[PDB]
Amino acid sequence: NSPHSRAMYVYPPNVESSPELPKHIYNKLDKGQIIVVIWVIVSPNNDKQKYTLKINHDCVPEQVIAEAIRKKTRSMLLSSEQLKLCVLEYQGKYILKVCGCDEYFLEKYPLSQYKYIRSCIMLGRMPNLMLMAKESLYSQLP
Numbered sequence: 001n002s003p004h005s006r007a008m009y010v011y012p013p014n015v016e017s018s019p020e021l022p023k024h025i026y027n028k029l030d031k032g033q034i035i036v037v038i039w040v041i042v043s044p045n046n047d048k049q050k051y052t053l054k055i056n057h058d059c060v061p062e063q064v065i066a067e068a069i070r071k072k073t074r075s076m077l078l079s080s081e082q083l084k085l086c087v088l089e090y091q092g093k094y095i096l097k098v099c100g101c102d103e104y105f106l107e108k109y110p111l112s113q114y115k116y117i118r119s120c121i122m123l124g125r126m127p128n129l130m131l132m133a134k135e136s137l138y139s140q141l142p
């Protein structure tokens with residue numbers, strides 16, 4: 001069984017039944033966009049890095065990663081194309097986990113469809129996601 005299938009079995013997304021947001025919830029956002037907080041502990045140093053993005057609620061976990069790249073990288077003054085290219089090279093190496101929990105964003109559903117994210121919006125809290133390598137997760141697998 002592929003590491004993908006094992007992940008998918010073990011860490012199934014906890015989601016709402018449909019991707020449609022009720023207005024009462026959509027209207028808590030700024031123009032449909034959610035403010036989220038991406039944590040990373042990377043490389044050899046394992047320093048606590050932290051980016052705060054503002055993204056459409058309906059983005060897919062990987063598009064969230066993409067904005068994570070854009071944010072970290074903005075001081076490189078890269079061109080659109082130099083950037084998008086790199087984003088295409090990198091996006092797929094990593095996934096999102098809820099900080100401290102064992103809840104993963106392993107599914108191309110919209111972010112606000114995930115129950116964690118929807119709960120945050122309701123409670124008016126910022127989601128705290130954690131960015132990590134696919135290899136990292138495949139290694140942790142029972």
Ligand SMILES: *[C@H](CS(C)(=O)=O)[C@@H](C)NC(=O)C1(F)CCN(S(=O)(=O)c2ccc(Br)cc2-c2ccccc2Cl)CC1
Nearest residue numbers: 040042043068069072073083086087090094131132133
């Ligand atoms: C393209 C690379 S380049 C030098 O122009 O060819 C630019 C747009 N991207 C990056 O520099 C980047 F995508 C490389 C990968 N990460 S990372 O900081 O090296 C990183 C390594 C390991 C983990 Br686990 C997580 C991350 C990471 C940290 C912070 C934000 C996003 C990520 Cl994926 C980011 C930058």
